[PDB]
Amino acid sequence: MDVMNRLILAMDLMNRDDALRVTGEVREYIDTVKIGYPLVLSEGMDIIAEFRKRFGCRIIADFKVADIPETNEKICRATFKAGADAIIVHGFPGADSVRACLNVAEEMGREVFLLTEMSHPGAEMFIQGAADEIARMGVDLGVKNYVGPSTRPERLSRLREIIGQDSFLISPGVGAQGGDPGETLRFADAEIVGRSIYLADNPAAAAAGIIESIKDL
Amino acid sequence: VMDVMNRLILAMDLMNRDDALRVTGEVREYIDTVKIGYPLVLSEGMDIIAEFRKRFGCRIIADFKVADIPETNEKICRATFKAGADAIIVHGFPGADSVRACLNVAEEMGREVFLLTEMSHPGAEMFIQGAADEIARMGVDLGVKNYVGPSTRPERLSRLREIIGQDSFLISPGVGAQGGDPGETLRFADAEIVGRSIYLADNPAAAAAGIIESIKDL
Numbered sequence: 001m002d003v004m005n006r007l008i009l010a011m012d013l014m015n016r017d018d019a020l021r022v023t024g025e026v027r028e029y030i031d032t033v034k035i036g037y038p039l040v041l042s043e044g045m046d047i048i049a050e051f052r053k054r055f056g057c058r059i060i061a062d063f064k065v066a067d068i069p070e071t072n073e074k075i076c077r078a079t080f081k082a083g084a085d086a087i088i089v090h091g092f093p094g095a096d097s098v099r100a101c102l103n104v105a106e107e108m109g110r111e112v113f114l115l116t117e118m119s120h121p122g123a124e125m126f127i128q129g130a131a132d133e134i135a136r137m138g139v140d141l142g143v144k145n146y147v148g149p150s151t152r153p154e155r156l157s158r159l160r161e162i163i164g165q166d167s168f169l170i171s172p173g174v175g176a177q178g179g180d181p182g183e184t185l186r187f188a189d190a191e192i193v194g195r196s197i198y199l200a201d202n203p204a205a206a207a208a209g210i211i212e213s214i215k216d217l
Numbered sequence: 218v219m220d221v222m223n224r225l226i227l228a229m230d231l232m233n234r235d236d237a238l239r240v241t242g243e244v245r246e247y248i249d250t251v252k253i254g255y256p257l258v259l260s261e262g263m264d265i266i267a268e269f270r271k272r273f274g275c276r277i278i279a280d281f282k283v284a285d286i287p288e289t290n291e292k293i294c295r296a297t298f299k300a301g302a303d304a305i306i307v308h309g310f311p312g313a314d315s316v317r318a319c320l321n322v323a324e325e326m327g328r329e330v331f332l333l334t335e336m337s338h339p340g341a342e343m344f345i346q347g348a349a350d351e352i353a354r355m356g357v358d359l360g361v362k363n364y365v366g367p368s369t370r371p372e373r374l375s376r377l378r379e380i381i382g383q384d385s386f387l388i389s390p391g392v393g394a395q396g397g398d399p400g401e402t403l404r405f406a407d408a409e410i411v412g413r414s415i416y417l418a419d420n421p422a423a424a425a426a427g428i429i430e431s432i433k434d435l
């Protein structure tokens with residue numbers, strides 16, 4: 001997966017006008033957009049096709065899929081029908097729930113990203129202690145795409161170790177949550193950035209600044 | 218606590234508006250509380266909540282299993298309550314800050330959070346089950362009043378009821394298709410959630426009536 005500038009925009013603005021304007025302003029720097037529930041629940045699933053029409057970008061649906069297998073299958077089907085290229089799935093609910101997502105992705109020509117450890121402080125309570133095992137589960141299931149935390153580079157490095165160099169790894173928590181752009185890319189193929197860009201006084205300059213800081217990466 | 222008619226909540230996971238509306242209307246004499254999840258919302262839009270409210274008397278629980286960082290959780294809850302959901306279901310496994318973010322929005326907006334502790338499917342045994350008692354205790358500490366726990370594991374449902382106390386409100390999926398028993402489930406839960414056993418039936422009204430008849434004394 002060729003992600004331009006190793007930078008994925010987390011487009012969590014909640015109105016269509018702002019989301020489209022800001023994405024347009026940074027389009028020269030980014031060809032992959034992560035669209036999540038803040039935008040989708042505010043503006044509808046049709047927003048995914050609109051992003052493809054306007055920007056011709058890759059779309060990762062960050063839906064943190066975390067239901068039973070039967071419901072997961074339905075969520076993935078609805079998501080891929082809307083034109084998402086990939087979907088993010090939690091590992092904590094177990095292997096059957098992940099497999100349900102893998103099945104639909106194969107059927108529709110899409111990718112599953114397995115979220116293993118999260119970036120926020122609460123992740124330490126339950127998720128972190130399960131995360132290595134969740135990653136091994138991903139490997140056992142044939143998962144090739146993973147999400148791990150910029151905010152804990154030692155944990156991000158461990159995730160990379162488990163999954164190997166061939167697997168694809170993206171990482172949120174850069175900027176607003178404290179993760180460093182350059183350090184994150186020691187381990188992740190691409191980093192996810194939301195507020196540091198979309199809440200910036202000048203989103204284009206913010207994106208440009210981030211890329212300048214990782215220029216030699 | 219919410220007064221759920223017949224202690225029975227419809228899990229409306231059909232994925233087109235016409236069928237979802239037909240079936241929900243057919244069971245309206247038996248059920249006044251409907252759980253709407255992502256299968257229907259991602260297929261038809263958040264305006265499906267509006268349509269259900271307009272057409273039927275029903276309370277709406279948005280089963281979105283909110284499982285993000287605090288900042289994103291807040292946004293999800295805001296959008297969901299703006300659309301008219303009475304309540305939203307949130308995962309506990311991402312930890313206390315993520316749950317608190319949802320509680321804060323619910324408090325501000327005059328709505329309710331349901332905390333999902335243990336899940337009903339086989340995969341729940343891998344990671345969730347071992348954390349579930351602590352997730353429930355965390356909910357109690359945070360002041361959560363509404364909970365979700367699994368009908369498929371009566372022993373676990375019973376323990377969750379103990380942890381949250383008799384005053385908390387507990388709803389429970391996994392009845393019917395997943396193997397949970399209607400009566401046994403209501404020994405511990407205030408209300409049972411039923412999806413496929415009703416919405417895939419040739420006569421959803423008869424299916425609902427049959428489930429209720431089997432728990433009439435309760």
Ligand SMILES: O=c1cc(O)n([C@@H]2O[C@H](COP(=O)(O)O)[C@@H](O)[C@H]2O)c(=O)[nH]1
Pocket residue numbers: 010012036062115117118119120147148149172173174175176177192193194195196285286289
């Ligand atoms: O562990 C995780 C997994 C996520 O997908 N994300 C998400 O990635 C984004 C981070 O955005 P931001 O750069 O504004 O902190 C959000 O959309 C958020 O929901 C996260 O921050 N940490």
Ligand SMILES: O=c1cc(O)n([C@@H]2O[C@H](COP(=O)(O)O)[C@@H](O)[C@H]2O)c(=O)[nH]1
Pocket residue numbers: 067068071228229230254280333335336337338365366367390391392393394395410411412413414
């Ligand atoms: O532990 C859980 C939590 C849930 O919300 N649910 C959900 O409750 C419903 C179960 O429906 P059904 O009766 O068709 O098995 C679904 O909407 C599903 O996503 C579950 O089955 N087990």
